[PDB]
Design a protein around this ligand. Structure first.
Ligand code: 2BA
Ligand code: 2BA
Lengths: 180, 181
């Protein structure tokens, strides 16, 4: 009865499989990013425990100190899924202040299928309670990890960032960025 | 433990919930569509048994008689999911020849999460065999109906079209189109 299992597979085959092994090559297409130092070429997938987000990350409730700042989008990646439709995959680059030091540059994204988990818990409580939802998050997380790590082309090109709605996303990002 | 179960929920909350109760109102935004007769304002969701499609529907392997023809896109519906990003939901209108009679007009779409089922069966056979895939289709289908039918705003605004890769999608569409109220 685990909805998260099918949510992870879709995320991979319907998105990450295309965009993760070409991300680094796509970022370097722009001189500004090619020159930039302190730039991690890995996609940071934000996974809030409450599966919720309602606004842009700069000056967000997750960024009280106003450290995160939108810098711009990457080069669009042309791809067709099923041959039925042609899309342009692009990502957002954010600038994270590191105090007096040169600010960091990274690619952050939310796990869009997590909204489906939240939406369920609010629209159909008889199918998913706040407790089950919290469990499905863990399920989604671990299952996603397995899928990704089972792909050589995607290994080392991503990072799963799990945090609580109280934690400072800026303080969490840096702790990861340096360890990268 | 059904991958199809989670595939249906995402389809609804991440798409159909937004686009289905506003589809008819969106179609009438174009004069050409307001005038057009023999036009069903319901979204026809194509569900091939093999979870596969590789090209445009006009002149496709599902349309040997070459009756289906792209007519144009509907008016885009601006909507935000999570408020983080703004998208434009639009759909494709197709013209289905009905012999000597006036051709039909409808909105057909594929169930994009079905590709994930196919992709699995080819990339990870040890997780989904060709047989399980066929079973997950039924699961996805039956579950999807329930979710939709459980929403009053979406009722009567959709239709599930199930067919085999051998059947003529044009011959299948009409059989549904005519039977539609
Ligand atoms: N489920 C989702 N989660 C997170 N972000 C999403 C999203 N769906 C769309 N977006 C973002 O919104 C952009 C424009 O969406 P739009 O729906 O108006 O126009 C879309 C849409 O009509 C179609 N498209 C995108 N994803 C699709 C999908 N999974 N299935 C079917 N059509 C899709 O391709 C067009 C352009 O795609 P493009 O990626 O270059 O650009 C997309 C993408 O960046
Ligand atoms: N262009 C893009 N940019 C960013 N992320 C992308 C993306 N295309 C796909 N994804 C990711 O993969 C999932 C879509 O899986 P799938 O496309 O097979 O199945 C999708 C698709 O069938 C439908 N859907 C979502 N957005 C759509 C759109 N703009 N147009 C048409 N269908 C859409 O809803 C299903 C679940 O989508 P969900 O949003 O919950 O979650 C998305 C999203 O997490």
């Amino acid at each position: 009865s685990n909805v998260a299992d099918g949510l992870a597979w879709s995320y991979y085959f319907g998105y990450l499989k295309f965009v993760l092994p070409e991300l680094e090559k796509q970022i370097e297409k722009t001189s500004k990013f090619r020159s930039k130092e302190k730039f991690v070429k890995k996609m940071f997938i934000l996974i809030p425990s409450n599966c919720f987000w309602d606004d842009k990350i700069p000056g967000s409730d997750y960024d009280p100190q106003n450290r995160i700042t939108f810098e711009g989008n990457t080069e669009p990646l042309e791809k067709t899924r099923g041959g039925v439709f042609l899309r342009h995959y692009k990502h957002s680059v954010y600038e994270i202040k590191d105090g007096e030091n040169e600010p960091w540059f990274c690619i952050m994204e939310y796990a869009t299928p997590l909204l489906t988990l939240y939406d369920m818990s609010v629209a159909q409580p008889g199918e998913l309670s706040r407790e089950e939802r919290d469990a499905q998050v863990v399920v989604f997380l671990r299952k996603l990890q397995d899928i990704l790590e089972g792909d050589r082309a995607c290994q080392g090109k991503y990072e799963l960032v799990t945090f609580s709605p109280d934690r400072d996303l800026a303080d969490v990002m840096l702790r990861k960025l340096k360890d990268s």
